């Protein structure tokens, strides 16, 4: 799937914010037709970062959520500030 057509929007919930600081992890709502390989490629190519792991699920409201773990050399907080999540 095109790298720029997978991500729908970042998640700005308390849980996502806590994960960003604690586990070097970003949370995105992505297209339901996107696989883990597509999500990894999209995140890496868009943000110029290396991603360690991806865990995806489908919420009860029909959307697809993806937790992406960044490598230790890259800080998820920096990307969150770049996107304005803070």
């Amino acid at each position: 799937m095109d790298p720029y057509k997978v991500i729908i929007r970042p998640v700005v919930t308390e849980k996502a914010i806590s994960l960003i600081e604690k586990e070097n992890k970003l949370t995105f709502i992505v297209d339901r037709r996107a696989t883990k390989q597509d999500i990894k490629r999209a995140v890496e190519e868009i943000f110029n970062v290396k991603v360690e792991k991806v865990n995806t699920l489908i919420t009860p409201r029909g959307e697809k959520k993806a937790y992406v773990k960044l490598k230790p050399e890259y800080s998820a907080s920096e990307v969150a500030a770049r996107l304005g999540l803070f």
């Binding site: 720029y4 700005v12 304005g84």
Partner: peptide, 18 residues
Amino acid sequence: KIRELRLQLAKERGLLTM
């Protein structure tokens, strides 16, 4: 331009809930 606009659209959608 399409790429940049898609980035901005995602960012604004995030800020909407933020």
